[PDB]
Amino acid sequence: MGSMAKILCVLYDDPVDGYPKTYARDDLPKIDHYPGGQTLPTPKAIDFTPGQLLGSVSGELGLRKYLEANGHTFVVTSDKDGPDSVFEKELVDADVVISQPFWPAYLTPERIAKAKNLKLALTAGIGSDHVDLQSAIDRGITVAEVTYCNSISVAEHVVMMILGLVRNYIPSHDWARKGGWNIADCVEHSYDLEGMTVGSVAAGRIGLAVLRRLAPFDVKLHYTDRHRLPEAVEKELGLVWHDTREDMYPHCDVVTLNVPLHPETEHMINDETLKLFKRGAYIVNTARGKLADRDAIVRAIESGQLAGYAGDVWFPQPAPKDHPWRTMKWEGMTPHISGTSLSAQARYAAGTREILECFFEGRPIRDEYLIVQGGALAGTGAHSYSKGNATGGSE
Amino acid sequence: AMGSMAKILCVLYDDPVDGYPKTYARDDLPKIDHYPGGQTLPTPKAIDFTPGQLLGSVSGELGLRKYLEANGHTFVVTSDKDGPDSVFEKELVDADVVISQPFWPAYLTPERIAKAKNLKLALTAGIGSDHVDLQSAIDRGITVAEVTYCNSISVAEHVVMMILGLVRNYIPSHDWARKGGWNIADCVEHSYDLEGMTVGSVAAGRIGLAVLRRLAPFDVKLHYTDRHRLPEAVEKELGLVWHDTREDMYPHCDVVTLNVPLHPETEHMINDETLKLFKRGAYIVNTARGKLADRDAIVRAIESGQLAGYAGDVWFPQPAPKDHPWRTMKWEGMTPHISGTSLSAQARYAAGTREILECFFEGRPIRDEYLIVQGGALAGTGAHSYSKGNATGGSEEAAKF
Numbered sequence A: 001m002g003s004m005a006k007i008l009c010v011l012y013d014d015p016v017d018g019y020p021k022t023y024a025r026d027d028l029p030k031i032d033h034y035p036g037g038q039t040l041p042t043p044k045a046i047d048f049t050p051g052q053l054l055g056s057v058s059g060e061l062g063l064r065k066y067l068e069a070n071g072h073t074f075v076v077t078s079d080k081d082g083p084d085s086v087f088e089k090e091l092v093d094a095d096v097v098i099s100q101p102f103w104p105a106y107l108t109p110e111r112i113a114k115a116k117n118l119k120l121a122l123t124a125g126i127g128s129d130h131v132d133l134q135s136a137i138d139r140g141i142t143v144a145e146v147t148y149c150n151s152i153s154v155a156e157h158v159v160m161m162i163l164g165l166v167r168n169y170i171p172s173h174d175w176a177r178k179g180g181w182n183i184a185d186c187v188e189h190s191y192d193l194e195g196m197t198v199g200s201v202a203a204g205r206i207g208l209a210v211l212r213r214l215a216p217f218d219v220k221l222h223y224t225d226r227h228r229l230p231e232a233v234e235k236e237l238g239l240v241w242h243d244t245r246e247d248m249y250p251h252c253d254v255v256t257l258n259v260p261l262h263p264e265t266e267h268m269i270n271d272e273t274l275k276l277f278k279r280g281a282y283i284v285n286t287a288r289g290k291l292a293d294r295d296a297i298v299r300a301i302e303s304g305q306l307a308g309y310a311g312d313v314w315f316p317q318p319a320p321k322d323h324p325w326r327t328m329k330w331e332g333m334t335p336h337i338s339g340t341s342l343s344a345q346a347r348y349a350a351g352t353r354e355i356l357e358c359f360f361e362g363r364p365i366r367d368e369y370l371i372v373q374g375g376a377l378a379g380t381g382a383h384s385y386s387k388g389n390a391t392g393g394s395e
Numbered sequence B: 001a002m003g004s005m006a007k008i009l010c011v012l013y014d015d016p017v018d019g020y021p022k023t024y025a026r027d028d029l030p031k032i033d034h035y036p037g038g039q040t041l042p043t044p045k046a047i048d049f050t051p052g053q054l055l056g057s058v059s060g061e062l063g064l065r066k067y068l069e070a071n072g073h074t075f076v077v078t079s080d081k082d083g084p085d086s087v088f089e090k091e092l093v094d095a096d097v098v099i100s101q102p103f104w105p106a107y108l109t110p111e112r113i114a115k116a117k118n119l120k121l122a123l124t125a126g127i128g129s130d131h132v133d134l135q136s137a138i139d140r141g142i143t144v145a146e147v148t149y150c151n152s153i154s155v156a157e158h159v160v161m162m163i164l165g166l167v168r169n170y171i172p173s174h175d176w177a178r179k180g181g182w183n184i185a186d187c188v189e190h191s192y193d194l195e196g197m198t199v200g201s202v203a204a205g206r207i208g209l210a211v212l213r214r215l216a217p218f219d220v221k222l223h224y225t226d227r228h229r230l231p232e233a234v235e236k237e238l239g240l241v242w243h244d245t246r247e248d249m250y251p252h253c254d255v256v257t258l259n260v261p262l263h264p265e266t267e268h269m270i271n272d273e274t275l276k277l278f279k280r281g282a283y284i285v286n287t288a289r290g291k292l293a294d295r296d297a298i299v300r301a302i303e304s305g306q307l308a309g310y311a312g313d314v315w316f317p318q319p320a321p322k323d324h325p326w327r328t329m330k331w332e333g334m335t336p337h338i339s340g341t342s343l344s345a346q347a348r349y350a351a352g353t354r355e356i357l358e359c360f361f362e363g364r365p366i367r368d369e370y371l372i373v374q375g376g377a378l379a380g381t382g383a384h385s386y387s388k389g390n391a392t393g394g395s396e397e398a399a400k401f
């Protein structure tokens, strides 16, 4: 084997107008730790300033100087799609691949077979479903992610989109923008959240933060999860437990999807399960696009079974220009941005460095960061995932 | 002058462009039993509508027609409200009762009030009476009433939604998705987490306190000011930081929310001079009244980067002219004035409007919490929350739309 590694890092493009020389504000708020006690990332040092854009090609997650100083090769590219890409060419001899879920470099079974030297697939972000976990397990490849880095960010985004759907924000803003007023056109589809029932599939780090933020809105809170929360937490929040997600759906005005993507959860929202939803239900999905059958959502919107769908995640990513969720009525869509706010980037850039430092010094990666290690699901992977391949259709 | 039958003049907004809906997205509304703090829900003798129907538009008539005509009253409903010859101003000369909503307000200026020979009651179906010249009402012995707390919770939700939308850069990001882009860096170059930020509210009244309660779990620092300080127990539970004046509060805040009524004390309180007090890249959410903010001062602060965003549903005048600068500015989260008129809110203020009318026509006193002006002075909620004066100056620009 060898002591020097090729690190291949896939990042999204700089803004169309160029890498920013200024930002809207002087500083970021200080965050001391995560809810529940997990500490913030602890790299030995960082080479960036918090609040800077780190996730684009010019930002490089602040890793270049550290990696090159240790004699490694560091390759950064945004060109990820196809057999022809810079990514797939560099992939053959890469020891480490880094990408973000917002601009994911899909490690399919085929691509992993081509990556002869691959020892570590690192997600700068949360969720590894763009990596085929079964292949990684079989190859002894480590899969790691920076757990909890943007969980709270996404929770804010969920509550924002819930309110946006129920109150009919996006169509109302269009009227204001176009020179209209059109009150009746706006509120013909507009309700208060107060008194509604909201269910969450998975109360994990995001799901629980969502339930906490919804509590003062005086809604009824329902959830299901692979792992039940402690009674103290359920009593505090007035949570109503359900054994299965299908038992939960008919109770809910709003359903929010907070669960990772793996064979148990893939296309869990489909023509059949949508029949369990109340007429005029809302779905917010900030977890993974492929949790929902794309055309089933569209059909449910057109038939009135759903009063709205919003989320920032699509499949595949980037979404094709003709992807149907872009144009459907009653949509609150954004590109996949919620986990990559400037506040979040500072955290996953630091965590990325921490994981790499541990990896190259032969120290153990934090168990909470692990998805796959030593030929098995480990750490957060053992807790939140199941073995299998979720990358089908990413081409 | 005195008789048992009244002419009620009711100004409502137009039906949807495609026509009045006979069906809705959902089967019924959530049950709401009372308001936080104990004020009971409206108590009309009966209601002639189903909760969830569109009541605030001209075909909806606030569900009042059958009740009014059965008692021999004349009920005129119109959306034509702006200008000297509008249906509204012609019918106004002999009206005993005027009803309008803040979303499509029939401005009762001194001039209009002077022309209204029979006007005994100015009824706001909704909250905030600043579209009525209160000094003229006071002088004429006209009663001014509104349906207090009817949509306060609806607006607080709208506020949190817009704070999150501004801070996280929702509107521009959605634009990229709709136009076929992806463009992550363009979205998030302006995108921050709310967590850890400082949020101040001007006024913790029914809306302000509901906003503070909804913001608490987002782990922000909460600041506020008001004419009346909250009880120590409430400050303690929410970790609120009190300021005596709104100008002492601004320099601390990443985000400022305006929850205060419009009257001479608050008019244009956000202007070039007070904006110098804000942190760079501050956000303002204003769901209270458009005229709280000098409109061009807001535009200048957005263009200079003093503000990183401005959002709200309220404009001055209303409807906003097509060339109103807040329509085209960057970093805005604007909607037309809809937050207090969701289908859930309409059910409550329609019932409240009916309750006030029934009281008025039976000679029973209107609930104190509903009163703004009664018997020649600020009374009830009016005494608590308003100051005397005339806020309707410049409202004639609405006729432009």
Ligand SMILES: NC(=O)c1ccc[n+]([C@@H]2O[C@H](COP(=O)([O-])OP(=O)(O)OC[C@H]3O[C@@H](n4cnc5c(N)ncnc54)[C@H](O)[C@@H]3O)[C@@H](O)[C@H]2O)c1
Pocket (backbone or CB within 6 Å): A126, A127, A128, A148, A150, A151, A154, A201, A202, A203, A204, A205, A206, A207, A224, A225, A226, A227, A258, A259, A260, A261, A264, A265, A286, A287, A288, A312, A313, A336, A337, A338, A339, A340, A380, A383, A384, A385
């Ligand atoms: N929109 C974004 O930018 C963004 C950022 C983070 C996560 N996401 C996604 O959201 C997911 C959740 O994030 P998280 O931080 O809360 O992770 P988490 O591991 O803390 O929470 C996941 C929860 O899902 C539960 N789970 C797994 N399989 C389940 C099943 N079959 N049925 C019910 N529950 C199941 C787990 O028990 C766990 O509680 C992530 O895996 C990631 O894919 C999106």
Ligand SMILES: NC(=O)c1ccc[n+]([C@@H]2O[C@H](COP(=O)([O-])OP(=O)(O)OC[C@H]3O[C@@H](n4cnc5c(N)ncnc54)[C@H](O)[C@@H]3O)[C@@H](O)[C@H]2O)c1
Pocket (backbone or CB within 6 Å): B127, B128, B129, B149, B151, B152, B155, B202, B203, B204, B205, B206, B207, B208, B225, B226, B227, B228, B259, B260, B261, B262, B265, B266, B287, B288, B289, B313, B314, B337, B338, B339, B340, B341, B381, B384, B385, B386
């Ligand atoms: N966008 C909408 O649809 C909508 C619906 C309701 C009201 N608004 C507006 O919001 C305002 C507030 O509504 P509310 O239900 O909270 O009413 P509220 O009367 O309960 O609260 C008003 C608060 O403002 C305070 N106040 C009055 N003058 C003040 C001053 N000079 N400085 C500081 N505080 C002052 C009062 O003490 C009171 O606490 C209304 O007057 C109305 O104009 C908007």
